[PDB]
Write a sequence for this structure.
């Protein structure tokens, strides 16, 4: 099972920079969403959930096929709330119908990270929409009520190592949980990409509590929260060292996140030797827009 990247016919960097820009301008415009967080965080989560269905063993799932557009995956209980991201992207897809679904979903995540002042994420085009029967079954995305050993094992299926796992989890600086989506009660929320996930883990005074959906989560007096899988990163000694590294080196976190996130978004894709190089999109700010 091979998924070969195929450039949308006649398209080049500039074409995709126009899609980036349309996302980025809508992100700026539609600022009321989720008590003024805006859509950045949910777009990052979308890009991650369309990619995170991948299985290295048989190359099923992953971003390539754009299968989140199909009912089985759109209605996965793990994907509750991501409909908001899909709806945000709908006008963009209508404006630029030449782009594939998987390309759009993943570029939405890239755009959101960069526009939220995160690292540059190189991004490759050529994902090709696949039929409805290629949609992966529900249940391939991770549980939050688990420990470090569960997280480590789970991410082996995505070919991620300890450093890659700890780096990716830093996206949990963004946004918040919503009881109605996931059974977790959200805490202080932000829409700027920083290493604050690691700083909060190490510096806050955490208390284990049971929320109104009966689930355990870690809460701080300052109003922040951590999932049990987040907190696991300071329970396990291997994860803890990495957490400390990123809490103490913003640039290293940025560089490692960028690599991991691009890898996550490209898992399962075979890029021809003469495929275009990855694109690095300019932010609205870099363009003076
Ligand atoms: C063990 C792995 C992970 C678990 C169990 C997990 C679990 C969760 C849960 C339960 C939520 C709350 C959803 C809601 O209530 O709306 C959430 C939100 C979020 N997740 Fe994760 N996640 C994990 C990994 C990741 C990764 C790898 C990324 C991306 C790199 C990511 C990005 C986000 C974002 C940005 C949000 C905020 C969404 C919003 O504000 O709407 N997560 N996650
Ligand atoms: N320290 C925080 O409250 C950052 C927000 N946060 C912590 N864990 C999270 C998991 C998902 C979304 C946001 C999360």
């Amino acid at each position: 099972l091979v998924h070969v990247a195929s450039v949308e016919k006649g398209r080049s960097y500039e074409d995709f920079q126009k899609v980036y820009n349309a996302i980025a301008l809508k992100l700026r415009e539609d600022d009321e969403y989720d008590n003024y967080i805006g859509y950045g965080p949910v777009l990052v989560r979308l890009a991650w959930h369309i990619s995170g269905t991948w299985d290295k063993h048989d190359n099923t799932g992953g971003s390539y096929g754009g299968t989140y557009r199909f009912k089985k995956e759109f209605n996965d209980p793990s994907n509750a709330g991501l409909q908001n991201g899909f709806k945000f992207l709908e006008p963009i897809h209508k404006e630029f119908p030449w782009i594939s679904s998987g390309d759009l979903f993943s570029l939405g995540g890239v755009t959101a990270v960069q526009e939220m002042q995160g690292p540059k994420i190189p991004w490759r085009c050529g994902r090709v929409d696949t039929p409805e029967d290629t949609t992966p079954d529900n249940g391939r995305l991770p549980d939050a009520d688990k420990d470090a050993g569960y997280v480590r094992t789970f991410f082996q299926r995505l070919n991620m190592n300890d450093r890659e796992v700890v780096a990716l989890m830093g996206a949990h600086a963004l946004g918040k949980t919503h009881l109605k989506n996931s059974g977790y009660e959200g805490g202080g929320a932000n829409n700027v990409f920083t290493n604050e996930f690691y700083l909060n883990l190490l510096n806050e005074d955490w208390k284990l509590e049971k929320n109104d959906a009966n689930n355990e989560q870690w809460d701080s007096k300052s109003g922040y929260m951590m999932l049990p899988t987040d907190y696991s990163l300071i329970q396990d000694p291997k994860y803890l060292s990495i957490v400390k590294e990123y809490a103490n080196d913003q640039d290293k976190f940025f560089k490692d996140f960028s690599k991991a996130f691009e890898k996550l978004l490209e898992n399962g894709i075979t890029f021809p030797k003469d495929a275009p190089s990855p694109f690095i999109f300019k932010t609205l700010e870099e363009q003076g827009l």
Notes: The radius of gyration is 18 Å. The beta strands are 3-4, 206-210, 216-220, 225-226, 269-270. Residues 142-260 form a domain with the Peroxidase; domain 2 fold (CATH 1.10.420.10).
